[PDB]
Design an enzyme around this catalytic site. Structure first.
Site, short mmCIF file in Angstrom:
data_model
loop_
_atom_site.label_atom_id
_atom_site.label_comp_id
_atom_site.label_asym_id
_atom_site.label_seq_id
_atom_site.Cartn_x
_atom_site.Cartn_y
_atom_site.Cartn_z
N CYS A 209 63.65 37.38 30.55
CA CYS A 209 63.76 36.03 31.00
C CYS A 209 62.42 35.41 31.37
CB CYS A 209 64.77 35.99 32.13
SG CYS A 209 65.42 34.35 32.30
N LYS B 168 62.53 44.33 35.27
CA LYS B 168 61.98 42.98 35.26
C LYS B 168 60.86 42.83 36.27
CE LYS B 168 63.62 38.18 35.46
NZ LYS B 168 64.86 37.35 35.49
N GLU C 166 69.89 38.98 28.42
CA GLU C 166 69.98 39.34 29.82
C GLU C 166 71.33 38.94 30.40
OE1 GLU C 166 67.82 36.83 32.40
OE2 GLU C 166 67.26 38.39 33.85
#
Lengths: 278, 278, 277, 277, 274, 275
Positions: free
Chosen positions: A154, A121, A49
């Site tokens: 993440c 995300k 990322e």
């Protein structure tokens, strides 16, 4: 009956302008070609990322720092994947087509240069991060060696619901790209293992590495088998390449090989499904 | 501002009749008193799954091998907890009040001898287990040292939804009592840590230990901090006592340390809530 | 495309007469049936060295303490393997047919009760062991799930030449049955891993466990994959069962992904029977 | 009754011409002097494979990228070893005196400046590397503190026959210099331990470290005692210095303290005869 | 230039009478003979704290549970050491010669049956232990293979001052016999290594193992090099034997190769440590 | 009921003149503000030994390489601590005001810019280092989150007497700043844990990281709880930030929850008779 993957502990970018972003794109492309030449059997290369645009919290939502997905930047990633004949996973902070706050997006491009997966995300912080909560769900695509690939980003990997959704939609390999600081190194390794075991699923996970003047990013590329066991573990150095052979068919066999109550006993599942979770 | 717990790696019973069950009851009661005498600060003692009746797969559903909850057996456990002034966690294979398949049940007794929590295994370890899936949800009670206690049983702890449900209902300490064989020792340790970290929650977990003629049960009592770190870890010997001091209000403080997107992005969450997880 | 194995950390026998040996045979046979009942997918069950006769160093070469291979004892093992439909690996201290020092022997029996492999310890743990050095080489047989099985015994696994010979003859799974004391626990785990990696080979290894009045045997059943990684690791308790799924085809595939003259004087000397430090 | 060694996790060179090689040579010289200044008791400094010339696979066989052994380059290493009064281990890709394919060579120079050991890589991995298989066997020399030194290179350490040959010829310390990428870090550590234990021998091993634009080299300098135990372990950072005290007489004592001569291994016979098929 | 030692993870006794103490003596002596026969090079066998008398906290200060040091019980230990030609380390709860609170005592017998070291626990594991604080300091004796041996007991090894005193008196090997419960397994391993490194000293340490109806004792025999590295580590099983070769002169070589700034050192020396 | 600390695996300085020392000062100050910026809850930032002036053994005792404490350099650190509102731990090789051999000194500055602790290395290792043995004892100051802070330097942490002295004077958090080479990485980790457990005390320890052309400094920032357990462990990379939450009150609670000396070494040491 398997494929080779390379996880790049890409050095954390210090990005102060579009010019730096272009430099990151050229370096990523050079890393695709060089890694394939070093690992001729490579079929899946994974970048962390923020590898394209960095974590400049003062500028990362400005127009200069954002791209369209797809756009000229992904077209360049796609041409590189097509010339090296690899699947590639990339990170792009995406301009919101409706004018609102931008997205934190990941894509997979196949060896023919086609974008076969776009994911936004789902779980931004959102104390430090400004990205809009992903609205594309958690997609799954066909990968190499009989793999069903899913990507999460993440913080997504800290929620067991993310890995659960990936496997529920058919994924037998979950890819996790992250830009974490050293503070959650331990928890990073733990959830990568549990995400694998709880779903009988491979996890391929890699983080940025090095110091950007604020945080040190731990890198620590990690491959876990479908029984939760870490097969290979990188350290905290920039440019470490974590490689492993993955056999997705064994994950499929385990799920097939290893009328029941269908009702839900969990209040949190009901509240979450109905948007009343509190 | 915390409390001391003791996890008993109770030797797996080899039970051939009701007389053997009675022997386990007296041995469990003796362990309550002796462990309290050895650790005068003790407030929570935890016994594993099947510690009362064993795993005689040929008779464990017969009426002779089952008890009512509450009943004479839990009453004796209650008197022991009252005399030693401890909270106790006990396993009872429970006769179904309607004559159906029996339940795999756990109870918490408080230092006054009152049964403050009754839980029936939500996820029987199919196909080897004949227990009916629990119908009481996942309850939570008040425990020592400001704790909010929840119990789950064996296979339960492999599902992140279980630990998620416990924390959602206010538990800051999850107790996991188990009768696993050596085959899932690694996965046992892994999920006990992920259940802790993912919910900012302590986990106290213990398994039977020793050989019953079929399986070796690994014991391996385990205490995990709310950051997922293992504080104490037993080995595989029968009668190992794993103790630890637990500070529930630190887990609470961590949990407390626009508005958020309420929409659910997980199709498995919807389908499970709808009773159509498939 | 794989098979399930169970390694039995069998309790070290305390044996003072033939009746105690018969006692071990019954427990072993019963362990076969019970472990198959517990693990219905089981295809290969492994018992450690000396699990049948123990280590009574004052009697273990007397005729009372020795058996013939095959013999009534392995016939009983064979019947159990047939009834439970498993491959079994067993240890028998074998009477020397010419009346000399006995052999330390291992056998594999298939799910139809046939003895498909007989092996005699090549490297007796000198000077404490009295066994004659094996004279059958290192045989290999076909096993479950596409495996090629070889067995070695205790001290054998410390010599990399043993694991090398097994792979050279086509084995993709090496079985190591042992009766070591706790002194070599670390070296035991180390060589089980290197034996696997150096030959792109699975290693399945298990030792006796418990105390016999002289030594504590460490148990520590261990499964290593062909990259030298330990997949499963038991501790030191008697009756621990170490299970694992093994995929022999993956080792074969790894091998298919890969001068003539010899640069090693020790290879020349050993081949010539002149190895001398 | 021992000696201090330092293993240099030398940064992987990126070499495009002889000027880049000259810079490695100087940097190596500088490292000899600086490490001795920091560790006054030092007697053995070890540099990894390719530390002099890098891994430019497009040019590493051209005349520009090769050296003679001994030559001006090793004479410079010799002067530094002499000035700092240490033993030094160096890597040089050697021009073949016959013509033909060059060699992957390692040398040891003593504190007097004399080249006491010259070794040519025996197992040069033909798919990627162009080096001709070594033709000097596996030599052994006298080292500091009563040590008997042998060197092996990279892939050599994966063959147990290499560590066996070193010990057979009297070596009680095996030095391993390598230029591996991160892909075999686990197997590197594993074989360094097994090479030591199987031969009651110290192993001193160090890899290049850092990124050359293709691979990341893991470094991870490692010292193992004669029981197989890792005494000190470096990480993956360039310029990490892994030091340890070694007691060669303890390995000698273990071999002195603590039979059938025929060969039972078909692979030994075939390999000795060049029939390894 | 070294010696072989064996640490016995002796099963925790459950003792109800002096006859049961004689049973442990019987079992200990048999262990001396069997371990030596199994390890012919053995020179130092170590038994844990309370291995002779157990931890019957209801009776362990009654006269029936106490012995004189030396006495008939150590005489039997001594004859065994002489018969097997080994140094032996033993635990005896010792009757106080003045009738006061008993001592927690350890002895070393040499291969001739001579008691060459007697030590009384300086730091009783309060408040669960009733033993009087030892009054013989921390002695050091000559051992096998050029060793200078010192013994400490259980709680003693948690105080860095104990290991420091041993090395200060010239010991290059510190023996630690213990009867800890599983609660301090981690801290047990930690201090065994730190005791070794801080004083360039080998540490040989062993605990009781098994369950006595109240506690589980973790065993976990441990040998640490003088650099603080653990060379051998046992698990938690009764009767595990942890062996290792030790080279005392290497610790000596390492050691060979003014005002006080610490107020606690002043206060302790003055007996005013508050 | 706790506080957040950050341990900086600061890159080993290669210093050849005063100008380079000023460069380290500005770099340390920048790291204070940037670390606080990234960790808003930060209350204690720790820099390793020699982080201000390096280890140029051929010049580290000359007047140019030495400072007074307090001096202009501490004032710049103190100002930076005041703007970021953090406690800071800094290393300064101190000019001896008596003209003798210089000192190896560590200081703590509070969020108000006040120097609340000044400590001179007690065990300077005579063979290699030239610093005079410290003459300020081992002080203890009040820190954040109810902590009682002590600092020790490098070799100090190998002596169990140092950690004991800190706890005896009330410290529930011992800070260790170091400039070790990789040779004692293992012993570094071991003593940080024993120092903690033996005294029911947190230890916060950090070393320089990287290569100065002679040694590689291992960094490896480490936080140990009062039971001796390592809570967080950095690796060996320059600029790794090791953070952890510390709860001093639980060390205090654990401490709350025959008097004559039996040790001849304590007697001799107290009397200067130790040999």
């Amino acid at each position: 009956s398997g494929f080779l993957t390379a996880l790049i502990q890409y050095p954390v970018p210090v990005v102060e302008s579009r010019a730096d972003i272009d430099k990151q794109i050229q370096q990523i492309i050079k890393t695709i070609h060089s890694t394939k030449s070093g690992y001729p059997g490579l079929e899946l290369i994974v970048f962390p990322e923020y590898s394209t645009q960095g974590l400049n919290t003062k500028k990362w939502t400005t127009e200069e720092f954002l791209c369209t997905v797809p756009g000229p930047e992904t077209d360049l990633f796609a041409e590189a994947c097509k010339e090296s004949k690899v699947y590639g996973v990339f990170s792009i902070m995406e301009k919101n087509p409706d004018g609102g706050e931008p997205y934190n997006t990941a894509v997979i491009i196949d060896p023919q240069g086609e974008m076969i997966l776009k994911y936004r995300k789902l779980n931004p912080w959102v104390p430090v991060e400004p990205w809009k909560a992903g609205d594309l769900g958690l997609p799954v695509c066909d990968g190499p060696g009989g793999s069903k690939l899913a990507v999460c980003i993440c913080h997504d990997g800290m929620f067991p619901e993310v890995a659960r959704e990936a496997a529920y939609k058919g994924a037998n390999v979950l890819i996790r790209i992250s830009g974490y600081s050293t503070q959650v190194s331990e928890q990073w390794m733990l959830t990568n293992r549990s995400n694998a075991w709880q779903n009988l699923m491979y996890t391929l996970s890699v983080n940025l590495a090095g110091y950007d003047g604020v945080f040190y990013y731990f890198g620590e590329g990690q491959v876990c088998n479908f029984d939760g066991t870490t097969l290979v573990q990188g350290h905290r150095n920039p440019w470490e390449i974590v490689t492993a052979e993955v056999y997705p068919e064994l994950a499929d066999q385990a799920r097939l090989g290893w009328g029941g109550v269908k009702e839900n006993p969990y209040t949190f599942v009901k509240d979450l499904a109905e948007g009343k979770y509190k």
